Design a protein around this ligand. Structure first.
Ligand SMILES: C[S@@+](CC[C@H](N)C(=O)[O-])C[C@H]1O[C@@H](n2cnc3c(N)ncnc32)[C@H](O)[C@@H]1O
Ligand SMILES: CC(=O)C(=Cc1cc(O)c(O)c([N+](=O)[O-])c1)C(C)=O
Ligand SMILES: [Mg+2]
Length: 213
């Protein structure tokens, strides 16, 4: 099997069905003790929790689902009737993510879209009945953060106050995205210093709030 199958199996055997907190704890234990994996992790996850709680977004778009750790993290804090859309182009990972959300009991709040964000974002309004997004979590391949931010803008999916929250702006780093949003009057930016998941390596999240065109 794969590392991602092993993470899912560990959750199934070390967490409680319908208990998202125990799912997060099981993933973080497995990835600390056994196999590193690119989940946002508990240190940066706590910052995300604080952001989600501050904004109480009704519609969140996640770019990059992997095994479902950040989808579980965010969906467990969504208010009743709020929703998360998560885009994941790797079908093996999308299948793991669905099973992770099912185990956590959060599947009614999350819709997985299997495809590439650059192909799916232009379809959100017509095919997925989106007006504008309240919050976007960018955590896919780092060279896509800037192109997809610009694409979300072009597609009319950002409104004044939409929160963009970007993982890994230090490691691996997203230099063009970071320079662009920090230099742009269309975004108000804040940096949240933290640590790379499961490692004593400095990383950080960037929050970029859209200000309109
Ligand atoms: C860092 S992992 C996501 C981790 C997840 N957000 C978490 O914290 O649990 C990055 C993911 O982005 C996916 N990916 C990369 N480029 C993508 C794209 N253009 N569209 C959709 N998914 C993409 C990869 O297949 C991978 O699963
Ligand atoms: C390239 C890679 O795998 C590494 C970290 C990483 C961490 C993330 O949090 C993340 O989202 C992504 N990503 O490529 O999407 C990657 C390292 C340290 O090698
Ligand atoms: Mg990441």
């Amino acid at each position: 099997d794969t590392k991602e199958q092993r993470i899912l199996r560990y959750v199934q055997q070390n967490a409680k069905p319908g208990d998202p907190q125990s799912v997060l704890e099981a993933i973080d234990t497995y990835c600390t003790q056994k196999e590193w994996a690119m989940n946002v992790g508990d240190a940066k996850g706590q910052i995300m929790d604080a952001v989600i709680r501050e904004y109480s977004p009704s519609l969140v778009l996640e770019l990059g689902a992997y095994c479902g750790y950040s989808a579980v993290r965010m969906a467990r804090l969504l208010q009743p009737g709020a929703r998360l859309l998560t885009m994941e182009m790797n079908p093996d990972y999308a299948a793991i993510t669905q099973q992770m959300l099912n185990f956590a009991g959060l599947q009614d709040k999350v819709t997985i879209l299997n495809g590439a964000s650059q192909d799916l974002i232009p379809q959100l309004k017509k095919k997925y009945d989106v007006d504008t997004l309240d919050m976007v979590f960018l955590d896919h391949w780092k060279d896509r953060y800037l192109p997809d931010t610009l694409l979300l803008e072009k597609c009319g999916l950002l409104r004044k106050g939409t929160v963009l929250l970007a993982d890994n702006v230090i490691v691996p780093g997203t230099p063009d995205f970071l320079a662009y949003v920090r230099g742009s009057s269309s975004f108000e930016c804040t940096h949240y210093s933290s640590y790379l998941e499961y490692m004593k390596v400095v990383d950080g999240l960037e929050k970029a709030i859209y200000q309109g065109p």
